[PDB]
Amino acid sequence: GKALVIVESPAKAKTINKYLGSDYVVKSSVGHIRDLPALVNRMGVDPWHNWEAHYEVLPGKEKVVSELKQLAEKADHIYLATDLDREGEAIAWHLREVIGGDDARYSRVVFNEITKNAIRQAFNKPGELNIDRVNAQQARRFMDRVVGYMVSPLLWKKIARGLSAGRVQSVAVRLVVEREREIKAFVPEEFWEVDASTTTPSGEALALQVTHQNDKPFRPVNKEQTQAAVSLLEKARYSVLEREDKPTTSKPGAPFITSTLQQAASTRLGFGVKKTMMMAQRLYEAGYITYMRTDSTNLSQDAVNMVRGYISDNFGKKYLPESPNQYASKENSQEAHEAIRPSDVNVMAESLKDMEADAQKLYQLIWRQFVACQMTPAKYDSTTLTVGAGDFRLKARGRILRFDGWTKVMILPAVNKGDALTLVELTPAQHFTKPPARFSEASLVKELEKRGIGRPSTYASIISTIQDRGYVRVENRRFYAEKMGEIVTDRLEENFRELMNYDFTAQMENSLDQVANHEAEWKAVLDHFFSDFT
Numbered sequence: 001g002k003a004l005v006i007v008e009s010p011a012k013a014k015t016i017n018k019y020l021g022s023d024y025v026v027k028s029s030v031g032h033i034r035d036l037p038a039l040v041n042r043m044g045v046d047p048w049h050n051w052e053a054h055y056e057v058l059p060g061k062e063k064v065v066s067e068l069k070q071l072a073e074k075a076d077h078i079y080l081a082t083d084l085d086r087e088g089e090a091i092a093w094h095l096r097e098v099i100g101g102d103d104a105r106y107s108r109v110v111f112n113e114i115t116k117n118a119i120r121q122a123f124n125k126p127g128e129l130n131i132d133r134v135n136a137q138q139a140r141r142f143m144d145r146v147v148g149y150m151v152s153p154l155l156w157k158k159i160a161r162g163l164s165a166g167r168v169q170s171v172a173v174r175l176v177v178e179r180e181r182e183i184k185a186f187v188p189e190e191f192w193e194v195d196a197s198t199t200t201p202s203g204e205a206l207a208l209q210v211t212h213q214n215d216k217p218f219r220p221v222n223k224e225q226t227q228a229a230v231s232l233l234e235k236a237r238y239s240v241l242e243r244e245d246k247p248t249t250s251k252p253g254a255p256f257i258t259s260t261l262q263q264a265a266s267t268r269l270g271f272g273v274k275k276t277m278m279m280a281q282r283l284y285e286a287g288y289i290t291y292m293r294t295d296s297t298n299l300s301q302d303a304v305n306m307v308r309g310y311i312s313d314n315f316g317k318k319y320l321p322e323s324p325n326q327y328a329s330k331e332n333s334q335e336a337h338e339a340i341r342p343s344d345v346n347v348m349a350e351s352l353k354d355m356e357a358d359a360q361k362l363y364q365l366i367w368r369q370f371v372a373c374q375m376t377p378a379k380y381d382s383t384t385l386t387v388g389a390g391d392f393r394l395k396a397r398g399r400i401l402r403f404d405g406w407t408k409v410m411i412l413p414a415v416n417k418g419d420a421l422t423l424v425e426l427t428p429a430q431h432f433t434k435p436p437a438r439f440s441e442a443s444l445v446k447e448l449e450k451r452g453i454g455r456p457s458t459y460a461s462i463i464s465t466i467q468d469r470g471y472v473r474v475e476n477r478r479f480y481a482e483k484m485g486e487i488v489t490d491r492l493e494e495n496f497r498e499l500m501n502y503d504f505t506a507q508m509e510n511s512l513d514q515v516a517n518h519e520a521e522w523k524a525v526l527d528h529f530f531s532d533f534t
């Protein structure tokens, strides 16, 4: 009968409750409490009557709503403590609209971390439900509903029952299909490379690749031109034309954001996209990391000071940059203002108490990326040898690590300019250009991000769905378009070319953000969407 705080999961309720006093009753409403269900009747949304929607409490959740009602009235003030993004904003909105009461009866608290300071400042300066966000979510919802209920039927008719088209997953399948057709159509190009094994004045071995002939790039295309070059190279005199020594540096990557976390988690840990977000959310809800749906590589000042503090103690001076390493500002298309990082750098992956082995591995990846992004660059001594042999130009590259810098948390022989090199053996080799590489789970996420097709909340879903529906399959960690995906794609491009257009999809995603950021109105965006779509 004090103050009621609503969160979306038991796990989140147990953690936030640690930072809320006696006058706070924390209750969770597992996921979506309310949602969408002739053609308009089934969709639960009317594109022909200014997007009139018909929401209804989820099947069976009729109890939860009541448990909340008689608990809310029994409450002083109601705090909507859902995740910070527009999705959590709509869940908050649905809760307020179902429990009822006056608006001044609710507050929307915002935090991107479940810690003592974060929850304090969140309940200290509570805000109001942001209607633009809610409308952005609704608009995305209505767009997906319209596409699915109006396109899936054509797939049932022209191909098979059980098939379903998605506004974004459809374009994602096209990306894999095109790549499949690009690969099958690829015609290998023959080309040769000549290498030269040589000896330094002191004896040390040195391998060189022929790069230029008569000051033009060396690219023989057949056995005949190669044999000619080899014959000249056999009788030429080899001498070092140049030894370029330059200090090179390697900078650490930026702290993670949703897409980069999925890419690295897949490549470095073999974790599937859905698994990463599941472990990530587990970590976030237990208060170990910052919100996991973000496209901001920005880091708060406190987090930066703390990890720099950690870097001094555990690595020393030479690893601590002069000034902090900045990557991006807090402003981005999405709601999250910070990157994915640990809530406390002092907490190692090995100390997490209620986490499975995989959630620990992920935290470990998140932790190391975060600490490394504030460490100094790795320093290398690069060596480029340019060798002359008659009319030919040869080169050899070398590199030796001087300072590991950030890599701590994760060679050519000697010869001077003018030195003579003894030709030991020439190795002419025939090769064939390779087809475009196939998509990996990591390169597909990157592709989706690069084209503006995906968002932090859809990357995973988009990649999981297309595999489940059977349009693509993964084999040996690489993506293969399935015949069914190719067939659905061609039919979709015939009947709905606009839907299958990359720029259309990316525009709609941008338009959604615009609604969220008060730069566009949702019904107008939906009107333009439905208009392009039909």
Ligand SMILES: Nc1ncnc2c1ncn2[C@@H]1O[C@H](COP(=O)(O)O)[C@@H](OP(=O)(O)O)[C@H]1O
Pocket: 527, 528, 529, 531, 532
């Ligand atoms: N550059 C422009 N200047 C003025 N009107 C435009 C316009 N582009 C589109 N419209 C109009 O805006 C409405 C929505 O179209 P669209 O979705 O393509 O933007 C259309 O009219 P109606 O609403 O009367 O049909 C269309 O003719």
